[PDB]
Structure formats: C-alpha cells, structure tokens
C-alpha cells in the first residue's frame, strides 16, 4: 500500500472546557524508527506540535497551547499520532491539520467545533 | 485553506463491461494555469494518466488502457480531474490513486469493485 495518513474521525463536537483527543494514524511496519519520524500538528495558522528527532520542539508552539497540548509518545510505536488538548475554549474551534513524515509524507484535516458554555 | 485533493466518492461498484467515471477534485482559484497542472492517475503499479504540460503523455501508460482511459481536459478548469474508463473488466478492480500537483500537491485513494458478468 502507498504511504497514507488517515483519521478515524474528521469531525469532533466537544463541550466547552472539556478535554479532547483527536487521533491521526500512520503506517508502522516492523518496529518504529523514531529518528525518522516527524509529526506536525497545527490549527489555522498556529503550530501546536512540532515533533522532530523524538522530542517536541517548543520553538514555534503557539503560546495558547503551553502546558495544554500533548502528543502521546508511547502511542507513536503503534502508528498513533494522537493529540490531546485540555480545557478547550471557543478559540480552539477550527480546522486542525495532521502532517506526518515517516519515509513518505501525507496529511489529513480534522474539524473541531466547540459548544458555548452552559450557564449556572 | 490548505492545498487539498478531495474525492466526492471513494468506493465505486461497477458492473462488468460498463463505463465508469471516478472523480477527483482540486482547488482552482481565479483562472487555470494549465502549464503548472500535473495530474497522475494510477491503479496498483500501473500508470493510467500522466497529464503534464497540458497533454496526456502515453510514455508510461499501461497498455490495458490504450484507447480505453481518458482525462476530460475541459473539466480541469473547474477543478475536476475526472477519469473515464470504458468497457471495464475484472482486471480493473483495485485501488486507484489520484495525484495532483498544482502549486501544492496532494492525493487520495479510490476503491473500485467490478461485479462478475451475468450469464445468458
């Protein structure tokens, strides 16, 4: 099969203030060569995750996601580039993109909608 | 929006001996710069369409598709890279891929299943 990036779900509707995990899958034959894996997560014009050389590089991470966004490293060996974002706000609504380079390269879009908060 | 290639339909079930049009769409802002458009159609390890510099190049077209496959040029200005294949046989079943380069580049997969013929 050709190198393809796939998303099990391309539309998330999350409640205000909750935590969400948007998932993105890439092919991992045999074992995982972590050195060759590059994972970029970004929504709109802001970077969220720049995973290069086995670590997350914070150089270009948008300040909104400081201590709020996380890429589970241990799931990468299963071909899962799952992105976690906690305490989502209305500014987190938009189109996310998941760009993965591991031998080949591909990307998919994911749409997230955030509901308005419920009053007291 | 980011440069993306999309397919309105990713699974075709066609009858034996019929004609099918599998569609693939790419973004065309303003007018179409035909010189910059490159469209590749291929299924399995065989090329079907190599559209470069405004014409189809037959250099690598698989012989099965000689006078059988066609890329409608006039629809390219609408962002439609629609592939026509006539008199489909059981050998035409498999995964097609639609690779488009126009400024950016992207590709999508399409699965075609061909029914067995009905007897007399």
């Amino acid at each position: 099969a050709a190198f393809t990036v796939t998303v099990p779900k391309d539309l998330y509707v999350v409640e205000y203030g909750s935590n969400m995990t948007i998932e993105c899958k890439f092919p991992v034959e045999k074992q995982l060569d972590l050195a060759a894996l590059i994972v970029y997560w970004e929504m709109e014009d802001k970077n969220i995750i720049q995973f290069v050389h086995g670590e997350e590089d914070l150089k270009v991470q948008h300040s909104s996601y400081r201590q709020r966004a996380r890429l589970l490293k241990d799931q990468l060996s299963l071909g899962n580039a799952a992105l976690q974002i906690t305490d989502v706000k209305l500014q987190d609504a938009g189109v996310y993109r998941c760009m993965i380079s591991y031998g080949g390269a591909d990307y998919k879009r994911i749409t997230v909608k955030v509901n308005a908060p419920h009053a007291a | 929006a980011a440069f993306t290639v999309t397919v309105p339909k990713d699974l075709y079930v066609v009858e034996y001996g019929s004609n099918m049009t599998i569609e693939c769409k790419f973004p065309v802002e303003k007018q179409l710069d035909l010189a910059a458009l490159i469209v590749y159609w291929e299924m399995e390890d065989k090329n079907i369409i190599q559209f470069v510099h405004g014409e189809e190049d037959l250099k690598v077209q698989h012989s099965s598709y000689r006078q059988r496959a066609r890329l409608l040029k006039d629809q390219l200005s609408l962002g439609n890279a629609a592939l026509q294949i006539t008199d489909v046989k059981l050998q035409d079943a498999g995964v097609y891929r639609c690779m488009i380069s126009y400024g950016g580049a992207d590709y999508k997969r399409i699965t075609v299943k061909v029914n067995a013929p009905h007897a007399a």
């Binding site: 970004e42 014009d45 150089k59 270009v60 993109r97 380079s101 990307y107 | 980011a2 440069f3 950016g104």
Partner: peptide, 28 residues
C-alpha cells in the same frame, strides 16, 4: 506577512511548499 522561524520549520519537511502549512504558506 510571515512568521519567524519558518526556515527551521520548513527546511526539513515537504509540508510547506506543498501547501500543507498555513503557518508558513508557500509564498508568505
């Protein structure tokens, strides 16, 4: 215009220049 550090962001990946990055568009 164009954000900073797009050179480090793009020099190792095809994500930019293929139209995939909105942070660093192909011609920013």
């Amino acid at each position: 215009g164009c954000p900073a550090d797009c050179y480090e962001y793009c020099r190792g990946v095809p994500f930019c220049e293929l139209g995939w990055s909105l942070r660093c568009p192909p011609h920013c």
